Symmetry: C2
Subunit: 316 residues, 2 copies
């Protein structure tokens, strides 16, 4: 899984990142670089119809659910290319299966003036003229890989040989679900972006900081993102609603509480939530009854309201 | 196509809408209503790497290319639902095929507080049926139609008797790429929200009205909506750029498009529709014309997909 040859290079990366993590700049820069570019920042939607089932509080939904697939990978990949610039590297390489991650990188590469080489297997090249051409309009060099079996793994190594030999100037940009993932802190940190955008937008739309920021927690990572900008705010409660059934308060929400919250979003708001998020809307709702009038509750609508629908329409 | 029995009723919508058209109160209420919902307002991106290839004017790109279609149908459907509410109609009906239009229609009625009934063909009731659930989850009655051919035609006819039947409180709402399009003043006015929104965004981001607002003319009726809102800003220049009222018209050569296109790709990592590329080409020109600092705004409208082919060959 990782050629020990990659160890000094991954280490130099991990090393430069930490240095970056020392303060708000790197994310600050990232935030500015995504603005208006490809879906960031996502909208923070005030659900006024929901107020009447929430103790006369004001619920704001932080629409993560409106991101589409890879404008989102672009926003992820830009921070990786912004790390190359800060590290001083001037070229970026990556591998690409069906070509989607190559198109993302090629995009950031070119947004930031970085040269860009993407490795892709000869099998992948012949049947994907379109992403290859995207990539080529965007400026990268697309290297059709003719060794081993001309598949994905194949690209991966040629890229590893490339990255080993060219580490002075070259940042390797990971992202294929089957490719390497050597840098988990990074990937968590980028999601704090969600928090920073909610903090700004709440200050904009309500004129103060919220009385509570809230997410469904038990789901992988990337709901948790909403919190971190808010940790410092002594006035702000942070509540993580856990999928029960029969610095942050964890609290539980039952299969029922979440379904009532669900159908109630469908009807009052016209938005169909992820089940995951219904738990959180349910709790935002608990919270506002419990906090009363003009309470300001920001809620993360995380993720993909595509059939949990299956499930929801059974529930009724 | 449209049954005559409908005419007393089409007229009334027509009278009412003609009323709210004219007025400032409508498109601001629809602005509020659609704010932060399904993709509106759309982003205004300062494309600062174009500046160098544009006399170092400042080029803002109105990003209609980021619109997921579908979040477009809701946005379009919200306006009829908004109009229905302002007639004092309380329930809304429509028809659908695979049932995309009915999903949107249901969506805007949940949001707006309207009872909703959607007509669908028995058969598409059968081949397509979470949409039917989607709808019901949104709280609309679905009338799955079991009358003659059990498909869209019959699904339009039920809808129309219901309509003629309940005129007094029922609005009907279209968009379905086949059923009726009785209101074409409407479809065209609702693109106006694009200029509306641009006009609030470019003052926030650039401190002032733009020097020029620029778009692609002889294609995709979706481009021109960026102008209306600047009409009463005399000394915002409006430039419609054509493939070769207050608005000037100006041609762009096949060649000039593709320099802008290529460049939009290499500098901003944005891949446009060829149509959009005509506007960018026009914005570059204008920049050099207008000078260091001009502020110029461009509708990048249209899907940066399958112009891709065309573009790759071209190089």
């Amino acid at each position: 899984y990782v050629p020990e040859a990659l160890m000094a290079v991954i280490e130099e990366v991990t090393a430069a990142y930490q240095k970056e993590r020392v303060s708000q700049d790197f994310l600050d820069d990232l935030d500015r670089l995504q603005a208006n570019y490809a879906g960031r920042p996502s909208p923070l939607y005030e659900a006024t119809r929901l107020s009447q089932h929430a103790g006369s509080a004001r619920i704001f939904l932080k629409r993560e659910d409106l991101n589409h697939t890879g404008s989102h990978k672009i926003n992820n990949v830009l921070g990786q290319a912004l790390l190359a610039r800060r590290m001083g590297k001037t070229r970026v390489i990556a591998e690409t299966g069906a070509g989607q991650h190559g198109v993302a990188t090629a995009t950031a590469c070119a947004l930031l003036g970085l040269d860009c080489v993407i490795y892709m297997g000869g099998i992948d090249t012949a049947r994907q003229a379109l992403n290859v051409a995207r990539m080529r309009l965007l400026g990268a060099e697309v290297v059709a890989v003719q060794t081993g079996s001309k598949t994905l793994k194949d690209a991966i190594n040629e890229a590893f040989r490339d990255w080993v030999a060219n580490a002075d100037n070259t940042y390797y940009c990971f992202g294929t679900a089957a490719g390497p993932h050597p840098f988990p802190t990074m990937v968590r940190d980028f999601q704090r972006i969600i928090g920073m955008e909610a903090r700004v937008q709440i200050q904009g739309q309500a004129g103060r900081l919220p009385d509570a920021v809230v997410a469904c927690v038990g789901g992988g990572s990337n709901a948790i993102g909403i919190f971190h900008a808010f940790l410092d705010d002594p006035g702000v409660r942070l509540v993580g609603f856990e999928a029960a059934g029969d610095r942050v308060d964890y609290r539980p929400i039952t299969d029922s509480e979440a379904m009532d919250a669900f159908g109630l979003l469908c009807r009052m708001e016209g938005i169909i939530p992820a089940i995951e998020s219904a738990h959180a809307v349910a709790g935002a709702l608990k919270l506002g009854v419990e906090l009363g009038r003009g309470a300001v509750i920001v809620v993360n609508l995380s993720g993909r309201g595509d059939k949990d629908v299956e499930t929801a329409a059974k529930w009724f």
